[PDB]
């Protein structure tokens with residue numbers, strides 16, 4: 005039916021990664037609420053047991069280079085596509101964020 | 114009211130580890146009875162500002178949403194540039 | 209304390225280092241640390257310059273599965289200059305020429321044809337037996353559990369049997385001897401079975417501590433447990449990783465003489481040379497394999513060494529290595 | 543002296559350290575019996591391993607934490623390839639015999655064979671005949687080209703990420719840093735390093751960058767343009783930035799006085815060079831002057847990425863033979879890559895490399911490749927001790943070969959504290975890091 009912004013932020017909270025991106029394509033209101041990067045922030049944070057750096061610096065840097073949605077779609081999904089058992093650690097985060105920064109620099113001109 | 118009596122019979126039970134599994138069985142019977150009125154049970158929760166019931170009732174909807182195709186998600190709750198844009202931006206889910 | 213007085217210090221160091229590294233690389237939930245395993249693995253590269261009368265070169269046999277083999281040949285004595293690219297696949301001159309098709313060990317999970325312990329073994333085989341060797345690089349478990357190795361072996365054999373430059377002038381045929389180490393010996397046996405079913409005529413078979421097992425606990429497993437570099441825990445780990453899902457250690461790939469297996473009566477099989485180590489955790493299974501070969505109506509020359517551990521053939525500092533090499537040379541040039 | 547029986551197997555253990563090593567192994571065993579699975583997990587995922595060959599150091603680390611070679615690969619081909627190689631080796635010897643009459647026919651002969659030939663050998667024959675054609679007559683776009691080499695081949699990304707880890711590890715504990723890029727190009731290595739210092743524990747330092755580029759009317763300002771975009775990136779992630787461009791015909795035209803270096807204790811210096819030092823061997827005495835300047839800089843790390851081959855022999859048909867094998871492997875790796883304009887412009891980039899390899903001589907020939915054994919001899923005489931690469935760098939290079947390359951058979955190997963990228967068992971490039979010997 006019809007749900008409010010904070011209502012979608014609650015129902016679309018417990019859907020993890022694939023089903024959220026599924027729900028990014030259904031409803032315009034849910035489209036906008038899925039472009040919200042806090043759900044993807046939580047999704048990406050679930051992949052790591054210990055990022056090794058504070059969340060305060062990580063969130064600003066990742067949103068300054070394109071956001072969490074693009075970080076998940078472009079790089080994390082290749083790294084999890086063959087086997088979803090393994091949990092990402094330091095090296096996976098470093099690799100994906102370096103690729104994201106290089107991609108941000110490519111668009112810079 | 115019906116949703117008022119529902120929140121009483123939920124929250125005194127809340128007042129009333131191993132308890133959570135049969136609590137979730139009672140919750141299954143609950144959202145079975147709370148079906149239909151579930152979506153307006155969200156509005157009742159917003160009226161009341163509940164915390165545990167809100168998470169529990171959103172969990173059931175989330176458990177539904179899992180693994181349905183676009184029009185499936187449509188017909189469960191009765192809900193071309195943008196279509197192709199979202200399809201291409203989320204292609205990895207469909208790939 | 210018990211393994212120190214049975215092997216030399218260098219062999220002890222090598223095997224203990226391998227054991228502790230593999231202990232680090234094994235994870236209880238059935239997953240393998242592949243990146244660290246490849247980082248810790250010591251490897252070499254092919255060289256077309258003859259060193260000590262042997263030169264090698266790699267051949268990409270298959271591209272869809274990335275199947276590769278390394279070919280070891282004796283140096284061309286007639287010529288003086290080092291061989292060129294065209295000289296690599298030069299026809300052999302000789303009435304009889306045997307080619308050994310070798311599979312390496314590692315319990316279906318470790319090592320490669322490029323490893324610095326199997327390259328040395330293949331070079332020594334060429335030098336001593338006076339032949340040519342083809343070392344296969346088959347897929348490994350648990351990423352490629354089963355039957356990936358048994359298909360890589362079949363493809364490599366089909367390739368080896370087609371090389372017109374490996375034919376012999378006596379009868380216009382290729383004389384292939386299947387050889388395997390540890391798990392490779394396992395593969396060798398199975399490959400020979402397949403070679404028996406088709407038209408390929410394998411003439412001999414060499415097994416060095418072949419890898420076989422079973423559900424029951426033999427007396428060697430109970431008595432010898434952790435005494436010499438091997439424990440039943442890691443043996444069961446490797447059998448679980450290699451074997452398919454929902455199968456026990458009585459699967460025919462584990463025990464060839466299981467009731468679900470196949471009978472070796474009325475079946476054409478090559479003559480076998482089985483070398484069984486004495487101080488081995490799984491000695492009883494290897495002796496049972498030899499006995500089953502003898503009682504199946506087949507030919508086999510059992511070589512039971514009383515005080516031999518695993519990996520005695522990786523260093524030329526013991527009498528067992530020399531005896532086994534002499535027996536292999538006599539078995540080949542017969 | 544090492545143990546001969548074990549050194550053949552790939553392990554460098556002293557003969558007089560044997561007992562000690564064995565004792566350590568015993569100790570290790572006991573600890574792994576006590577600390578058990580959890581501790582072993584710490585040994586796998588929370589540890590960085592260096593130089594596995596040195597058993598003493600590896601065991602010490604584990605104990606402290608718990609407390610001319612010719613490599614050839616034959617891919618499937620046809621006898622027409624042998625006829626092509628026979629024709630190609632016929633012209634190289636004929637042109638070296640001062641024949642210059644059979645060479646014209648032989649060059650024409652190669653052309654008639656190539657059309658019938660199909661596969662990667664047709665491309666290698668076409669590019670070698672053309673370079674053989676205009677050598678006979680000699681005794682008788684660029685920015686987009688290095689771009690197209692990025693999204694198609696994995697050698698540039700391997701060089702950047704693997705060198706960044708060595709620089710990042712050496713920068714820990716410093717408040718001001720300065721890196722000098724001998725191969726500044728378009729500055730694609732550095733955006734990935736800047737984001738790593740932003741998320742660094744303890745606080746990002748002050749990042750200063752200085753690039754050096756080849757002369758051109760536009761490349762003088764193209765280097766200025768590059769720093770314009772890097773300055774805007776360093777502000778989005780809150781990093782203090784500084785930049786200064788250079789124009790120089792050759793790296794031998796440099797000196798330490800004009801790099802504007804503060805004291806090294808105040809600002810840490812790290813020199814970088816990717817695919818640049820081989821272009822300096824054509825000039826006599828060039829490599830010894832540049833390596834005497836790097837020592838004058840006194841950096842903390844110097845990462846070099848080169849090509850693993852011997853294409854700088856004093857005999858022409860020797861250079862011709864090795865180059866034909868090496869560029870046959872490269873064109874074999876690209877055979878399965880899907881056809882695209884990036885792929886087409888990649889072969890032209892390599893075709894210009896082949897053509898400069900055999901047609902030119904003297905300073906005009908810049909493709910003077912060498913092997914790590916030869917390269918390590920030059921650095922060792924300068925005074926640059928090796929800096930070993932760990933398993934963290936190895937791991938990322940392996941996952942790098944899994945995002946963009948999927949079915950292609952590229953492998954990473956460790957050797958003598960270095961990293962190599964090759965096709966199957968055939969090495970192609972090598973990454974090494976060096977430090978001043980003390």
Ligand SMILES: C=C1C[C@]23C[C@@]1(O)CC[C@H]2[C@@]12C=C[C@H](O)[C@@](C)(C(=O)O1)[C@H]2[C@@H]3C(=O)O
Pocket residue numbers: 222223224226227230313314315319390437438439442518519520
């Ligand atoms: C876990 C293993 C694997 C061992 C036995 C051990 O218990 C420890 C030592 C391993 C080994 C080391 C190197 C060789 O590849 C091997 C065949 C051997 O002889 O000894 C390897 C051998 C084997 O493959 O069975």
